[PDB]
Design a protein around this ligand. Sequence first.
Ligand SMILES: [Mg+2]
Ligand SMILES: [Mg+2]
Ligand SMILES: [Mg+2]
Ligand SMILES: [Mg+2]
Ligand SMILES: [Mg+2]
Ligand SMILES: [Mg+2]
Ligand SMILES: [Mg+2]
Ligand SMILES: [Mg+2]
Ligand SMILES: [Mg+2]
Ligand SMILES: [Mg+2]
Ligand SMILES: [Mg+2]
Ligand SMILES: [Mg+2]
Ligand SMILES: [Mg+2]
Ligand SMILES: [Mg+2]
Ligand SMILES: [Mg+2]
Ligand SMILES: [Mg+2]
Ligand SMILES: [Mg+2]
Ligand SMILES: [Mg+2]
Ligand SMILES: [Mg+2]
Ligand SMILES: [Mg+2]
Ligand SMILES: [Zn+2]
Ligand SMILES: [Zn+2]
Lengths: 25, 102, 129, 81, 151, 63, 225
Amino acid sequence: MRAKWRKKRTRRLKRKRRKVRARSK
Amino acid sequence: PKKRASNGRNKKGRGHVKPVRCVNCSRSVPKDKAIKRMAIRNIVEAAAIRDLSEASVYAEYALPKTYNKLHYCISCAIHARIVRVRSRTDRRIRAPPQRPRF
Amino acid sequence: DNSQVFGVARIFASFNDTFVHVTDLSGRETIARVTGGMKVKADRDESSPYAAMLAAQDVAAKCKEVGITAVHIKIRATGGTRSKTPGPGGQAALRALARSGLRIGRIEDVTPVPSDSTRKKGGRRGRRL
Amino acid sequence: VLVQDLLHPTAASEARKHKLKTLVQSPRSHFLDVKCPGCLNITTVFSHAQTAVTCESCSTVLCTPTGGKAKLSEGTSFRRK
Amino acid sequence: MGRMHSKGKGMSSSAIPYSRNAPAWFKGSSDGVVEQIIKYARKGLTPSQIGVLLRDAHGVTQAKVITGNKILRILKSNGLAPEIPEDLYFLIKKAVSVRKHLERNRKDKDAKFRLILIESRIHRLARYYRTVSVLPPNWKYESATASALVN
Amino acid sequence: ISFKLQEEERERKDQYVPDVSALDLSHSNDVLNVDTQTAELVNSLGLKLPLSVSSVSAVRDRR
Amino acid sequence: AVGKNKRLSKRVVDPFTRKEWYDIKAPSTFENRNVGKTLVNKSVGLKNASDSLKGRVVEVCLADLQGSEDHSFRKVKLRVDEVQGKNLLTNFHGMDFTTDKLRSMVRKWQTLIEANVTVKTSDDYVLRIFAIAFTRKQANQVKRTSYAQSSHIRQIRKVISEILTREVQNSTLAQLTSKLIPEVINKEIENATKDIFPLQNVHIRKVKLLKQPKFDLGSLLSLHG
RNA sequence: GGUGAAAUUCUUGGAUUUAUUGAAGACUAACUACUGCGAAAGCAUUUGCCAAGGACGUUUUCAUUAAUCAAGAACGAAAGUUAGGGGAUCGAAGAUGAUCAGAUACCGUCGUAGUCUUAACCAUAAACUAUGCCGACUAGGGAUCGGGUGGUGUUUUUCUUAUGACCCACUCGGCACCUUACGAGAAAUCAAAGUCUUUGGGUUCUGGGGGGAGUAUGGUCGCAAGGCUGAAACUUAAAGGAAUUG
RNA sequence: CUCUAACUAUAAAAAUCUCUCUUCUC
Ligand SMILES: [Mg+2]
Ligand SMILES: [Mg+2]
Ligand SMILES: [Mg+2]
Ligand SMILES: [Mg+2]
Ligand SMILES: [Mg+2]
Ligand SMILES: [Mg+2]
Ligand SMILES: [Mg+2]
Ligand SMILES: [Mg+2]
Ligand SMILES: [Mg+2]
Ligand SMILES: [Mg+2]
Ligand SMILES: [Mg+2]
Ligand SMILES: [Mg+2]
Ligand SMILES: [Mg+2]
Ligand SMILES: [Mg+2]
Ligand SMILES: [Mg+2]
Ligand SMILES: [Mg+2]
Ligand SMILES: [Mg+2]
Ligand SMILES: [Mg+2]
Ligand SMILES: [Mg+2]
Ligand SMILES: [Mg+2]
Ligand SMILES: [Zn+2]
Ligand SMILES: [Zn+2]
């Protein structure tokens, strides 16, 4: 893997967690 | 490690230059890193100079030349034989390859 | 002048399917447009020198039937934002035009070269092949 | 170079070096006494003057400001001070 | 070769001659020189222009060599020293000029940065002149009040 | 390769010294051409040699 | 080849039987006034050919109009405006260089200075003129480059601009073309900037044309014969 | 058209080319360089206006006003986000036509958002010279840019001269470069990465094996994207740098 | 001890690999 794509996957995980929190905030 | 103290670009004090496109592959490459070759040639080669001379009005018509500065890519330059890999002690030399003909 | 009825050869040689297109001095009247792909089979050798050779023989014959005996070569590359270097076939086309009896005068290169391109096709990293 | 005088370097080398870099730093400029063809007054001017210097008697410039030193007028005659 | 607010490294300057006393060739009188300085100041000239005039049109190498006092000191003895020191005044003049240029066109960001630099220099010089009590301790540079001092 | 005959011939050709002089101003009617600077060199050396001053036309060839 | 999907979305004739040849007549400012021939459809009552001829722009090498070869690299465009029957008259329309010479003088290690000026001639013809100059290595310059500072370039541009304005507003494109043929404006521009910078290859290229006042027959026929 | 070769696509409602022109928007070729300016991003058509700036010259003026900087601030490539304007080219998504075992990838043809702008956000880049700033000294060689000095110098031509443009010598400042180790480094190499075990000129920031991890949490900024700050539990004997031979 | 001239012009496809490493002292 490249650091770029690991960072992007982390960002997508943050996407899912942020939408989950926003639905339950 | 530094393979090139000049970094290849030949910039040394600008920060940014405007890129130019490759003639073959259209690669947006900085104008100083890009390899520029001035193709000045004859609009009719020696294969047809005699034929044109015999079959042309305006006796002793000075035939025109054609000029084009080619901005090659660098992958293209390696591949299209324009520039060649060199010995590590030979990379030092920047003079052109010694006047192909005198 | 000994009444050499003049035309302009006006060759256009891209990297595929070169053009031989003779016209009068004004250029508003077009005669003998026959191209490279007009006469060769493979569809890949439209740019080949033989293509332009046969096209040149046809335009020479047609113009000779017309009455035009001398031509003015206007070599054009694909021009514009493109490679703008002359195609392989155009030189053979010019040679065959000069072979077939026609007289030659004032070769010019009239490729459209820009003060800059709008944008060159291919993306920032270009054609990867 | 290994052994060499700095207290007494050659005067040619003194004029060679830059101002502010001699043993004792002294200006390279000098003053001039200029006479304008108009009157007999002698005016004291600077080599590197910065103003359109004129004689008090006549409104005629004797020098001209320049990036370096003064460029004198056409017919004024000067003697170095 | 510092150039406090830029990357410059120049050393273009003037070398004061070794001899402090009067030049041998100078024939003018110190009292006449002081009178000339006073008259030039009364014309409304800052000390630097006074020194330039005395160096160009006359044989005055520099006032301290001829009289023994400096130009600003000579003016202060006669009470013609400006309330705002000349260099600080020129700094405020430049600052107000750049602020005018800015308020007449907003998008120029380089002159905005240059105004920031000039204001920083003004603050430094004001702090110095305030610690020597040349300026009152309540004196400060403000953007709105600079024009009145300049005008 | 070398041998006695060739080496002897080389030495004989080496021992050649012209009886006529190639120096001391045997040519140019006992006059040597020098510029001002080397003339001052001769002067300051404390020596009096037969010289012939000629300026060197400080303008340099464009090559 | 011979392939076509026939995505069309004998009544055949030879289109040369209904055609003929007219002659191109140059302005009297040029020597070889017989330019060439132009192929035209035969005249029809509903649509007369003579209407179709006017507006044509023929492009001819300048050397082909004066016989010499000093004008080899120039090029002149003539406008067809008045047809006399089996022979038509052409007025000046424009001027240009040949790309070959232009690229030949645009070389490295020297600054090209370009001057552009849009002006009105003595008549109401409105022209645009481009001048190109190149700094010249001195006949003693051991320094290898021959660059010119921006101040010199701006001064040179100002001089060329004022010279071109002067020599346009003081004459008509008849006289202006008669001046262009012996390129005396080039010599004058070079001489006027001799003090500023050497300026090799001072040339006037691509004399454009932007407007024509009216249709003045008298001078047009006066310009011929 | 296009390609390794093809196909998708447009075409006897006559496309592709052919001449004049007209509209739009972008951009500023060639000149363009081990060249310039700027704090860094960055800056390349002409002209005018607006202010600003480095360098040099200065027997001008003030006299320590200075260097680096927690807190605070100004700018900050591209991409991206709100609105209004435009809408040419090129082109994330998408639509397909190919190549393949698969190819919603590379090759190709269209193609929205975007690219271009006026306001408001964003503050991140291999934002690189991967070299903090100020100051001093140490070694030879040429060139190059800006300025300034001198030449009994050369062409210039306006009769002579004044300029300008060169030529020679010198100097200041700048991007740089060649040689070398007599210095330094683990070396690649560096004229600074030297003047460091013969260790101290001033000063700011950062790192203490790898991974977890620039993740979670808590703040804070943001409309959003995300930015700044930023561990541990646990796991591991290596990960890594330069160079040598295959 | 004097010197700046010649030249072009190739990009089809190709994925993966189970052991095992062994002392230098006259
Ligand atoms: Mg590598
Ligand atoms: Mg390179
Ligand atoms: Mg810089
Ligand atoms: Mg490849
Ligand atoms: Mg058509
Ligand atoms: Mg340009
Ligand atoms: Mg420049
Ligand atoms: Mg801070
Ligand atoms: Mg944007
Ligand atoms: Mg919008
Ligand atoms: Mg796709
Ligand atoms: Mg597919
Ligand atoms: Mg694609
Ligand atoms: Mg497209
Ligand atoms: Mg970062
Ligand atoms: Mg960094
Ligand atoms: Mg760690
Ligand atoms: Mg990490
Ligand atoms: Mg948080
Ligand atoms: Mg390694
Ligand atoms: Zn390429
Ligand atoms: Zn007088």
